[PDB]
Backbone:
RNA sequence: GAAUUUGGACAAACUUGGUCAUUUAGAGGAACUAAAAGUCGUAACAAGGUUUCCGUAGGUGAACCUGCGGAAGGAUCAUU
RNA sequence: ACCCACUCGGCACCUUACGAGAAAUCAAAGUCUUUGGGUUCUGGGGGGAGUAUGGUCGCAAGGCUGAAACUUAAAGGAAUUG
RNA sequence: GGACUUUUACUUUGAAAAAAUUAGAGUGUUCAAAGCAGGCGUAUUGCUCGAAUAUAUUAGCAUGGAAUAAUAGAAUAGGACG
RNA sequence: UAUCUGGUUGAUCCUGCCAGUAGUCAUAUGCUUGUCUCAAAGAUUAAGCCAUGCAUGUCUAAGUAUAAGCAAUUUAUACAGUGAAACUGCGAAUGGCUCAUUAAAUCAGUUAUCGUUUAUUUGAUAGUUCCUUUACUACAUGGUAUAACUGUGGUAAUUCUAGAGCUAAUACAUGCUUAAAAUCUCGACCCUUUGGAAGAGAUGUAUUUAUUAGAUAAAAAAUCAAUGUCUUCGGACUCUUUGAUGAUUCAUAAUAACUUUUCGAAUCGCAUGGCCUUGUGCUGGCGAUGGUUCAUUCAAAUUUCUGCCCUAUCAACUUUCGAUGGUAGGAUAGUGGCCUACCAUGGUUUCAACGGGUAACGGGGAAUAAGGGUUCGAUUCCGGAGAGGGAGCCUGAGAAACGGCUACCA
């Protein structure tokens, strides 16, 4: 099948090699997952020395992490909006590592209300003292704040769906978000 | 290729087993164990050729299945079980205990030891790391893992092993002046009173080694086994005491007694 | 040199697992990670205060220097972050009791922490396979 | 399979087959010492060459060289034990030119004739 | 959960053209060979009876012949 | 412009061999079994044969490059006596 | 641990260059090719020496020398000590 | 063991070459042949094709036996003696054979994995899991099928199998039971403002993601932000805690989560002992097998530097569609143009690229050698490749396996 050897294509001098040591198993390869959205269907694939791998297809949700507050939530994945490797991945909504995606962002909104409770966009005594102690944290960043009102946050898939079977990422923030924003608006 | 090999041809075994090149196509392949393949006694060689207790390979097998031979306090009833440097080969019957020590020529010699001190072994620590749940441990030259060691124990040291429990009784730091043993290299089988070592950052730390007769020589760090302080050792040295007596005076010495 | 307009790639370039928290504010707005390669090799000040990424940099990257150390003469700077050095040597032919001039070209990765031009003498350090043909990384420049 | 069995040749024929100065000398050695072939003389001269080769390689080395003395003593003793070399000539310089029939006369062929009880080498 | 089936990668095998070594063809054409006695002349070896030879060109049954330029391996180390 | 002595460079000649060579001869063809100053090119029995073949240059004549199969103890460099 | 560090070729010494094979130490195959055995006692209980050593170009590593042969620096001084 | 001799002439000074001479783990052949030891042997041409018969199976005290098998019971009315068959577990990836392919390829010496997998050995190493976890519950141990077997058949034929009926597991598939202590979260309420609470949940390991610690060449002061364990709230201020490498984002630990959810023993043989509130009550040894992770060992994969025969009647090659590098991603057990998208135009070469030939597997080595060398190495050891030619793949730790399977070609 697919091989990862180098006995094929030419050496640095440009010389064509002879066919020696026909394909061995330890140097095989497999097809991509090409993971789509919705109707979770994950197949397990056996690998060298056992240690079977997860080949995710059609994944529904994923564990997304907010680095600023150090929290992670399992949220629905909306779609793919930008991909450095290939634009066709975006049109087919295929999820790979380092893919810019949109998430529903609902669990963060409830968490933010449950943790600071000030507002997004725009009772007991235990409640305010925790919120009062957790002060100077409701002014995180303007651009990400406007995304919550839309109900669609921005994230980057930091996991490998074809390898581990999980689609996990983090919410874009800081100045890397601005880099992705300008490319999206460049149309 | 295509998988691990399960045979060891003759003329391919380590030369220190002293197996005759004729009389058989194959030599005993050591099993996987606490020691490497080339640095291995294995018992069928030791119980048949060294001690002459057994003549054939079948009656080598019979001895072990009666649970007579035990290695390091464990029976280890394996025909080709790998025995390595200073593994206490003890026999409950015949009330004899053997320790594996290199002779002057680098071969394994029979070293009968008293029962009182045949209940421990020295181990050269290879690596010191942290286990799971933050539990430090050390690995000796025979693969043993000992948890919660002394913090001052570092790499290249030698540790005495209780040989009844996994805990340690004593250790020796790897410093200049300590009594050392040559395990491997060209000078294999010598005791050499370490003097100085050269750092050689990047690889292959070296060390200078001086014999009791002031005969100095150099060997890699991987081949030196510290076995105590200068003078009194922690183990009973075999005959010869690791002097590398020259061939010219070897005939003179053997001519004295004839 | 010229900092090569670091953010002209189609993807965002950053040192992995190096977080610059927007919540707090301090000097050196972007945190930079660097390491000393060892073997008596000093990390140039260009890497400490630079803005490049160079995943394969020996000072600010995920590669490590280990193995053979070689010295060579630069003959090519045309590629991007890759140079070719020339390693001249004499091969002995015992029959004629005398020698033979020979050379070997070595493709080697070069970090933006070094500015190399053709004719320089640089020493290189072995690393894991970087490309189809590159297995070395420039660690010191000893010419001009 | 098993290790090969080591075997070696123990004689060498002369380069010139028909030379009268050597042809009659060969019949001389085989004459009064009862030998059935020239290979007996050919055999003896083979390690006679080997002995000289070892001795020549020893004299090239420097004096007091441990290798010169060690195999020098072994070679000088081993021929003295056989008796082809007299005790007086123990200098490693008289072994080079010992003789061609010195080895041959030490054979059991001659000893039975030397020490009576045979009254002829052919008997 | 079998048959069956969509798309894909690996890709045997086959057809069509380009490029890589050994064998048919002698109906043929023009070189060496081997040679106890062939034929025609007599080209070279002596000033070989026109010195020889080289290059180039032309001619001729065959060696060869001629022009031009060159050489001495010539038959001249030499005409104050 | 001649004469004498000397000198630097050059075309040559005369004598001799301590030297070389296979001799003929050679102040270079010497300083080479006492075998090494630097460097370029060419040769490996005589023929087949500067032929065959493939390139390449030329308008052409041909030049440059350049084998094999096969054949076989048989012409001189040099001197000597007739 | 600290900042500097002119780079080479060359040569000494040391570690590594599997076993068998090569040279070679000792030794009963009756000699020898071989083989690594064996030898020694009151032979009733048993004791013990061996199964060496050398060679192994080139490349890599460590190390001393620094003659020989290269290499770089201070010349419209942006040179050194400070 | 640094040696030569014959052959051009009437006679000669002389690399010629021819011939002679010696050796060959260099073959073949001819003639001849008494003994002892030792021993290569369908390599060369055809990695051409093969009848036939063999060359991989395997069990203990310790996985499963109602043989409608064999003997004796009297230790047993459930079983435990032997044991065909079959299920299960390992093995069959070793060995052995050959040298076709292969010319920076293999291979040799020498490096790295801080760039990976590793069945088997060996040492360590799971108190945490009844899930709305106060009746959901068997935890003195729970569910199903099925082989072997009985019976009914199909064909000329295969180590072909169908239908009907049982029965087991270390088969398959579920599944709980063992202390605490401590820390975090939420949080009733008194209500203080200096603030404390009842109560609930989580905190093993395995996967994935994000963040944090993993420091350390020297010594003293200024106050601002609030005191910060204890206060004479003046502030004494220390104890605070950190391993390894030449080098790390290393080991390890901490937080938030995630997982279609891994492991955390429903297994087997022998001995049967102590304690009482004498109940088939509670404790209790020697083992075997299995199991997550770590280390070890047997390995594997990739990889550093240098080194290979002959040819220019091969001088330029590579990049159409990968050729060289960058970024990102997929894939792999992993690095890597290994593959994909985009980008740049690179990379090798008279120090002989690229191409072509090899009656080329490479080495350890063999023959002959004064010294330098020449020729050979299919072949007893090491590494590589192959099972008629290619390709593809299941199982398994390990095969692109061929005495394993599928397809095409012959
Ligand atoms: Mg074995
Ligand atoms: Mg005529
Ligand atoms: Mg006539
Ligand atoms: Mg004439
Ligand atoms: Mg003139
Ligand atoms: Mg010739
Ligand atoms: Mg010729
Ligand atoms: Mg003749
Ligand atoms: Mg003449
Ligand atoms: Mg050097
Ligand atoms: Mg000669
Ligand atoms: Mg003549
Ligand atoms: Mg004649
Ligand atoms: Mg000649
Ligand atoms: Mg001849
Ligand atoms: Mg095999
Ligand atoms: Mg062949
Ligand atoms: Mg274990
Ligand atoms: Mg990549
Ligand atoms: Mg790339
Ligand atoms: Mg071949
Ligand atoms: Mg082999
Ligand atoms: Mg194969
Ligand atoms: Mg066949
Ligand atoms: Mg196959
Ligand atoms: Mg077969």
Residues:
């Amino acid at each position: 099948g697919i091989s990862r050897d180098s006995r094929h294509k030419r050496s640095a001098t440009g010389a064509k090699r002879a066919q020696f040591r026909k394909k061995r198993k330890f140097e095989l390869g497999r097809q991509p997952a090409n993971t789509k959205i919705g109707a979770k269907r994950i197949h397990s694939v056996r690998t060298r020395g056992g240690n079977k791998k997860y080949r995710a297809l059609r994944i529904e949700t994923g564990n997304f992490s907010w680095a600023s507050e150090g929290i992670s939530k399992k949220t629905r994945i909306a779609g793919v909006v930008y991909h450095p490797s290939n634009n066709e991945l975006v049109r087919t909504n295929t999820l790979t590592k380092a893919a810019i995606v949109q998430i529903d962002a609902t669990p963060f909104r409830q968490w933010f209300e449950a943790h600071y409770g000030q507002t997004l966009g725009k009772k007991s005594k235990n409640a305010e003292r925790k919120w009062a102690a957790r002060a100077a944290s409701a002014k995180i960043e303007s651009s990400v704040e406007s995304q919550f009102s839309a109900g669609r946050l921005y994230a980057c898939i930091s996991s490998r769906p074809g390898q581990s079977g999980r689609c996990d990422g983090y919410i874009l923030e800081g100045e890397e978000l601005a880099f992705y924003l300008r490319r999206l608006t460049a149309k | 290729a295509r998988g691990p090999k399960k045979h060891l041809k003759r003329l391919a075994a380590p030369h220190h087993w002293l197996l005759d090149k004729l009389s058989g196509c194959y030599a005993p392949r050591p099993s996987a164990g606490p020691h490497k393949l080339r640095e291995s006694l294995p018992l069928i060689v030791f119980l048949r050729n060294r001690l002459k207790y057994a003549l054939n390979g079948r009656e080598v097998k019979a001895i072990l299945m009666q649970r007579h031979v035990k290695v390091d306090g464990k029976v280890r009833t394996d025909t080709t079980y790998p025995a390595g440097f200073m593994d206490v080969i003890t026999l409950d019957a015949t009330n004899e205990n053997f320790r594996l020590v290199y002779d002057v020529k680098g071969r394994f010699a029979v070293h009968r030891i008293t029962d009182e001190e045949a209940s421990y072994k020295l181990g050269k620590v290879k690596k010191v790391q942290l286990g799971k749940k933050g539990v430090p441990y050390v690995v000796t030259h025979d693969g043993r893992t000992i948890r919660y060691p002394d913090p001052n124990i570092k790499v290249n040291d030698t540790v005495k092993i209780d040989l009844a429990s996994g805990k340690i009784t004593d250790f020796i730091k790897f410093d200049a002046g300590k009594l050392v043993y040559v395990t491997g290299g060209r000078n294999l089988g010598r005791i050499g009173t370490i003097v100085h070592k050269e750092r050689h950052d990047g690889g292959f730390d070296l060390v200078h080694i001086k014999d009791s007769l002031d005969n100095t020589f150099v060997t890699r760090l991987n081949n030196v086994f510290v076995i105590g302080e200068q003078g009194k050792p922690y183990i009973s040295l075999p005959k010869g005491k690791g002097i590398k007596l020259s061939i010219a005076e070897e005939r003179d010495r053997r001519r004295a007694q004839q | 040199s010229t900092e090569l307009t670091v953010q002209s790639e189609r993807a965002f370039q950053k040192q992995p697992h190096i977080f610059n928290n927007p919540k707090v504010k301090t000097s050196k707005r972007t945190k930079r990670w660097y390491k000393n390669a060892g073997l008596g090799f000093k990390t140039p000040k260009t890497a400490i205060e630079g803005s490049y990424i160079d995943k394969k940099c020996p000072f600010t990257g995920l590669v490590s220097i280990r193995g053979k150390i070689l010295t060579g003469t630069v003959v090519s700077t045309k590629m991007h972050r890759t140079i070719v050095i020339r390693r001249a040597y004499l091969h002995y032919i015992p029959k004629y009791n005398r020698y033979e001039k020979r050379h070997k070209n070595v493709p080697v990765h070069v970090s933006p922490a070094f500015r190399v031009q053709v004719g320089d003498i640089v020493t290189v350090g072995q690393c894991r396979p970087i490309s189809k043909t590159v297995r070395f990384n420039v660690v010191k420049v000893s010419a001009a | 399979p098993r290790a090969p069995r080591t075997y070696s040749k123990t004689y060498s024929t002369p380069k010139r087959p028909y030379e009268s100065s050597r042809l009659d000398a060969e019949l001389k050695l085989a004459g009064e010492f009862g030998l059935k072939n020239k290979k007996e003389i050919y055999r003896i001269s083979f390690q006679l060459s080997k002995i000289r080769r070892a001795a020549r390689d020893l004299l090239t080395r420097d004096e007091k060289d441990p290798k010169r003395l060690f195999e020098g003593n072994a070679l000088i003793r081993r021929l003295v034990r056989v008796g082809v070399l007299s005790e007086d000539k123990k200098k490693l310089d008289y072994v080079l030119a010992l003789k061609v029939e010195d080895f041959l006369e030490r054979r059991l062929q001659t000893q039975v004739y030397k020490l009576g009880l045979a009254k002829s080498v052919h008997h």
